[PDB]
Design a protein around this ligand. Structure first.
Ligand SMILES: [Zn+2]
Length: 63
């Protein structure tokens, strides 16, 4: 498609639980992508990831 779709489910870097709530229902810590990008053609948003974390509440949509 033209517009990029949000990455697949994530995993808690503290415990290791997978979910799509962006949060770990076990401990209560935000979840992160367990399978990060290894091959970057440009890596424009590479280091930017360090300052990519932001506060924004969104609503999920049913497929
Ligand atoms: Zn956790």
């Amino acid at each position: 498609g033209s517009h990029m779709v949000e990455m697949r489910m994530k995993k808690c870097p503290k415990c290791g639980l997978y979910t799509l709530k962006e949060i770990c229902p076990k401990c209560g810590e935000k979840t992160v992508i367990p399978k990060p990008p290894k091959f970057s053609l440009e890596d424009r948003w590479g280091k930017y990831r360090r300052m990519l974390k932001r506060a924004l509440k969104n609503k999920n949509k049913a497929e």
